[PDB]
Amino acid sequence: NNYDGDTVTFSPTGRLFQVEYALEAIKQGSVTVGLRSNTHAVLVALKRNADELSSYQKKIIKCDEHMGLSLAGLAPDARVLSNYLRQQCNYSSLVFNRKLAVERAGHLLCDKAQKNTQSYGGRPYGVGLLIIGYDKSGAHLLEFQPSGNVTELYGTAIGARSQGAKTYLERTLDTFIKIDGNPDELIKAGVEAISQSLRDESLTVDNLSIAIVGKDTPFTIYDGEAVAKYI
Amino acid sequence: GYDRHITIFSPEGRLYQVEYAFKATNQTNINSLAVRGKDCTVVISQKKVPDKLLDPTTVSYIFCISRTIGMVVNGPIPDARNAALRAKAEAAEFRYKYGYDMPCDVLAKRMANLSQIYTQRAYMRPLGVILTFVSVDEELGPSIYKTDPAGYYVGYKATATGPKQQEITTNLENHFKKSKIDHINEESWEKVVEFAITHMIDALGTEFSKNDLEVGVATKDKFFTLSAENIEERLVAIAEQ
Amino acid sequence: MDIILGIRVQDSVILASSKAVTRGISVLKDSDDKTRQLSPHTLMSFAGEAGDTVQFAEYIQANIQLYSIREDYELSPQAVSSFVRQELAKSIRSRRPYQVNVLIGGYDKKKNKPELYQIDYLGTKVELPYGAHGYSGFYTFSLLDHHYRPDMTTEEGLDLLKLCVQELEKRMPMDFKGVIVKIVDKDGIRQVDDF
Amino acid sequence: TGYDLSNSVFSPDGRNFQVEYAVKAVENGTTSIGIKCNDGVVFAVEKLITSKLLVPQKNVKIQVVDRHIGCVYSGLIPDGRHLVNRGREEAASFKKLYKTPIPIPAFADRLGQYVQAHTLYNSVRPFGVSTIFGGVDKNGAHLYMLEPSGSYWGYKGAATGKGRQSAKAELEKLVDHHPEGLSAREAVKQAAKIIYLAHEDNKEKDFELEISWCSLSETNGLHKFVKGDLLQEAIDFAQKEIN
């Protein structure tokens, strides 16, 4: 109200409204799902178009051979944060000959987002990210909020109508975690999860976007006729 | 009405942020007192540990700025420590640059100039503290100099700071009106501390245990604080006469 | 570059500058004009290290032309020469000084007098009736000391200049490929196309 | 009015309302505690399980500084991480110049001055965390708690977050019933109990217990997380006491 003009101002109940408004931009964004087993980690994203003549906005970005994310909200902010992850992954490789741990990648994103929430002049990031990766401690899935909060999860979903997919994963928890050494079945569970967030529209060939990473699987993105198999 | 938010003049020629910083000074609800002996300068302050979970040894508003200079603060602890750290740095820098120990009055002036800047520059807020510096200066002898958020400072024969400063001030005023001298005519610092405690008891009208007080003493070439047991010995002597 | 001469006569200033450009044992050009018009009645010839010469001359030219446009007024030769000197005196204590010596020949329309200024790379300025830079003056000054009058005509100044050049062509070991000659007077700047 | 719209502005009371609003963010957070024992300190925190999809034992909240200091906090988690990052820079520069690891009181002031600095200007926001921290140094064990204002003191026991009153009451009983002191292994058991008792204020969602400790005898004066059997033993002791 009087305390939402900038990010440097607490409200009387201790809330940061500019951060909450940035969080709102994620809810307007298209749905994206993340889930993992012990061997693989999968991202599934519903891409959004402007109209029938337009293309479908890309949702998934590769950060390294063993790591990448999906976005929901302001796409340019995802480009900035993903560029930062690319650099950090790359600094780890060039200096330490070491693949960046997914947990440490989350810690770096948290700290980068935080600086924008405490200083005058700047603004919070207006995007939510789901980071997947396979490192020395196996498969991982992270959820990033531009408040700075990063959370490691078995599965999750962000964007519009994401509550439906999140409930499904909460029921299926015991099943999909056990899908080891079977990438196609893990993707099926992800495609079935994101389907719980659909209304009116359905999953078409240029609508669906899938990504996977695992034990002997580099981070690869599937679009177009490559995902027709899963429709 | 933004003339009340930053340090610019109001139509009355006043600085409201400076005046409100003076009010923060009494937020701790602690009273301090400083007096001068022949060879020493004594400073006493009330100690209040309300929570049982607190480590009472870490609760303090008296600071050892240098070997010779001591400082008691009236105001919130964050601002108190801010001022303490700066004074320690300034005192150390002074000795390095000019080859002798920073006098109590010079440090007071320096900290007062820093405070003045906060009353003139908008981006910096005043510290909500009153700083009482004490020492036995090698040129001026026993010394008490006090700084406030306005950037004002002056030397004192004796002084008091806190919510009940006026009661303590008048009590001290009346004593020096009798004796007609600028100090406590006493040889040992032990008896000067006893005088300080006795006159605070009389002025405030409260009795003190060993854990209710905090004492700092300045002698030639060193300033030191008293332990609880040193204060207890001081309280026993007062009661026995 | 090599030889630059200057002589102030009754009603004009004459500048003579060599035509040759040399890189090592080879003559790259034999028709080089070592001069820039700073203003309609002010000409500057120059000589020194490659690059520095032209870079400096064109830098001065741009500044004087800028002044002319801003004020709609032509600076006096004296004012120009002082501006140039300050730029060179500034240059000499810089990280990499301009290695350039110049002659400034101008006609002051206010005083109705020709003026010649000699300025070296250090910023050493002197007003003269005649002057030279480098090894030029060593051969020519004895003739100029002998024959020069301040009431000379432009034609007499050119004849004395031919004599100076003839002496250079006899006793200098280096072939400088003749000179381009320019006259600065009340009517402006012109080139003598036959010399 | 308008005194609460900008940081570093004194109200007519002499108060900085922005700092007081930061305290509200702290009071909104989960419960965290600290217990000073005979030769060290124990830290414990309440982690709310928002969903079954949270991976157990992965979202670690307690943070180490250097190798001998533990830090835990309640409120805005990112603000706490920022403060610990600074704490690590302060500890590194101290050790770089002076060789010895940073003493706990020295470390406490480094954080205190930094947090206090964020109450001096309107171009920055105060920290939305209260931080409980401490460890073992040359002079023994130390426990501290640091508020958004930059205010900090030493503590026998400390608590913050939504269940701080319940926790404080439990800590006060231990201080009274153990004047001679509490052992490190006892303090771990008691820490578990207090977090479980403090969970009544966050009783809607179930939670995960996380404990750490520094002790001269048990951990050689190094910060370590309580894991496996010793953690389960503390959970069993805690569950037995609530029933």
Add this chain to the structure above:
Amino acid sequence: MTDRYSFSLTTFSPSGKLGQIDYALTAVKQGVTSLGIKATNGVVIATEKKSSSPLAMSETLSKVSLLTPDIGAVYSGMGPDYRVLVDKSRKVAHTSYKRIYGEYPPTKLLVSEVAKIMQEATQSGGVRPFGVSLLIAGHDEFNGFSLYQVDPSGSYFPWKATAIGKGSVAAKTFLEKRWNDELELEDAIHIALLTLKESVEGEFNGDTIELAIIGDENPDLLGYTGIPTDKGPRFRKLTSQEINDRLEAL
């Protein structure tokens, strides 16, 4: 952090007034009375030592300050602002003059430098004007004795005699009747004490009054002998006893 107040805090209002300067002048009006009188062979500046507490040692607080050996200053308004201006005035006298010309600046040029500092606080970013008016008395070889007033705006005026602060309007009227161009220094001191008594309520003695003069050279205060051309400072602060002696012949 960073000082993000890079804009002026003193601005013109629709009526053409510079508000902060006017408000600074109001703060000067509330301040304790101080005055200055110029004689044929000297200048005197004086003010009241308004002690905040009887426990406070008022000798430690100097309202009258030496800027150079031949220039002194007194003020009315905010004390802390005055103290920092004196520090800057003393320094600028060296950096912008003595280190260049090897001699102390004349009164008018030192005044000009102080004025500049006060003007900049009236236009620069993120600052308020100084809340003081200064009276600067001094002597130099070519200009002789002089007395200047400097206001919060940075404007300065030379005076034969004047007063600033609390009771300045009454004091200036009193000085107009008594001042003439044939006054000796002792006559000016006498008039200064008479004028100052009207604005003082309580005790009126050498311990509650601060008074200094710019007069003859004081070789006894120089601290060394051996250089004929160095004859000592013309600035002298009168002692408590010296003031009381002149209060008996009052």
Add this chain to the structure above:
Amino acid sequence: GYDRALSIFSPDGHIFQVEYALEAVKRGTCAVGVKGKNCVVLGCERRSTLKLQDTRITPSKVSKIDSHVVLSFSGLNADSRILIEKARVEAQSHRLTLEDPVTVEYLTRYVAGVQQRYTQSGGVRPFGVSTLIAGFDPRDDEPKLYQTEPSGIYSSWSAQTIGRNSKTVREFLEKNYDRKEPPATVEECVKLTVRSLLEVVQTGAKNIEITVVKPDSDIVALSSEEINQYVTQIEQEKQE
């Protein structure tokens, strides 16, 4: 440094500071530009509220940027000096680096770019100035006339006016200026420029300035008497 964003969008998609800069131009004295077949004429209004003026030394309204290009303006006078200085510096910088004088289109593009830069830079306000830039390109006999404005947009004009009552003189030019047959001579071009200003000026005495620019750096400013002869002939034909 002062970084404040002064030029910003409003809810309806307007940058008010840029639009208020146009109002400053509307207040400024009238300026007109007309290009003939082999010349360009720049006419300028001088407000007669200011007499006792020294016309020798008073800043003239038309400024030479180079020997072949001129610039006139309407709006804040002090602002115009900054644009003119920058333009003059750039003109010499172009000759210095590319060994050719600027084209009229290039110079206009530079000045217009400076104006634009001041509409999305922190801590600065837009120029309250619109300019008419006229001249002939090196070794070219085609007349050039361009206009700029605070927003930074620029364009070429057969004839154009700016400043106060520019709406009226533009109305006159739109019906009087024929594109198929522009003013064939200097006389016809100057006459049409004076006629257009006489719709707005008041008195035809010292209120009208005229500057003729011809090819190959031939620029001259007409005197009071020369202009007065045009004013005389126009009104004598009008009495019919």
Add this chain to the structure above:
Amino acid sequence: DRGVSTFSPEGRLFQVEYSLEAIKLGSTAIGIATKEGVVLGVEKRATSPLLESDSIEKIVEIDRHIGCAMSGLTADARSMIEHARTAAVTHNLYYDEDINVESLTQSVCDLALRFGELMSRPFGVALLIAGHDADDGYQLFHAEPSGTFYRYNAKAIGSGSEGAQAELLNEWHSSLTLKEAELLVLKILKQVMEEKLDENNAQLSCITKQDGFKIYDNEKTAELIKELKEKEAAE
């Protein structure tokens, strides 16, 4: 007042949304992508008849294989074009090849959100970036001041955009020829324009693999306008 980089309660940047309103006031620009090339067309919209319309430059070359049309505050586009040209040529310097149309568009869009308290406000202009490369063929992009860019088969921006976009919805198919696309842009421009469309107040351009980016002459466009009139009168 309020921050320049402030979020609204709905989660949108105020300034970005306000710049989009400025773009709606701009003159119409239309782009159509085919397998034979991409066509770009604009409304010139001269404010007066004395304004020489050929100086109105709302279609611009970025490289030989990339063209660009603009709509909105056109003065803001100059620094964007300058950056685009520099990016295209710099990539040719570093990699001895033509730069991908998408990569060029991404480079331009990186400037968009570089505003705060960097430039003081977002750009008040939208761009239609059309081009060809060997990997993805003929492409058309719409670059906004939000930093977002969508690829399009056909797109209209400016004042008559929503009316034109609905018309492009019905008319576009994957087998359109270049000649058919040219007439289609002219048709839709004529429909949404206030004044009557002719060769002087409207401009066409295209990008083909063979000939590269070309702005059409007024004589060439005039014939396409005459060809349009006759084919509409044919039924």
Add this chain to the structure above:
Amino acid sequence: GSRRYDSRTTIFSPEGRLYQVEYALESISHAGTAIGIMASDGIVLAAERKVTSTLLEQDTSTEKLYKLNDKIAVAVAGLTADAEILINTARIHAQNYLKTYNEDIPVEILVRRLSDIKQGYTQHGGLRPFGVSFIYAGYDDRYGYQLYTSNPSGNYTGWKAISVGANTSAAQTLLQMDYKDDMKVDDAIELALKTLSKTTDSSALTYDRLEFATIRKGANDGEVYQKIFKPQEIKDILVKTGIT
């Protein structure tokens, strides 16, 4: 943050005026009137000190008329402190020019430089403008005797006769009436004093309330002399012209 307290000194009003410049001009309209008159053989500068006191030391005082160099002088109207900042800058610029070109700075060039500085404070920096209006009186060998004025907008213009400060409307009408082109310095002196005497807000015009100066070629042969009038000399010229 800090934005909350920013007055924004360099913005347009909806009418296309600069707020602070207009308000600075309002300030200047309350300042003491200064008049400049240019004659064929010299220039006159006359100015009124504001409500003085009997105890003000006049002979060592200077609030209106300042010397920029040997050829150029200025009359001030507005904040004196602001004027002295600019005056010192102008003195430095004149010396820079002299060092660079070895010739005295042409009057207009000095005026343009100061006016450009004033302009800068209206377009960038976020600072308040200088509340000062100058009358420049000077001589050079190009244009001879010249009068200019500049104001806080940074705009400058040339004049035959001009007034700044208080009552300029009335003063300019009186000057426009009695001024002629073939006028001389002695006549211009009389005109300046008569104009002040009629426009003044004071009861009577006296020597102690005036500052006066002339720039004359009335120096021995082809050269220019600046004369800043002393109190006694102002008293004599007041009697000569028949005002007191």
Add this chain to the structure above:
Amino acid sequence: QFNPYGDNGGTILGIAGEDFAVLAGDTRNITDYSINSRYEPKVFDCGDNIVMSANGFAADGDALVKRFKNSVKWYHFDHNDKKLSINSAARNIQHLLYSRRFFPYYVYNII
């Protein structure tokens, strides 16, 4: 005085066929008259069907290769996984080398 350069010996050879290409190099690494390693790889697969060897001062050769491999990685990121052609790689490498014109990579490189 510190000499920042050294000589690690080694020799490399590149031959282009009609539909193939080879890049050969010995595996010996040396300083002065000593052997450091009898098998220290010197020719590397840099991705996109490009092989590279930077021969001379090993520390500069390792840095250049490392930077080119990095350049290939970022070329994929920035240009939609486009394959870096050999002619484009060559031009990129020139700019890597000339970026140190006044403190060169002391290597002779072949791709």
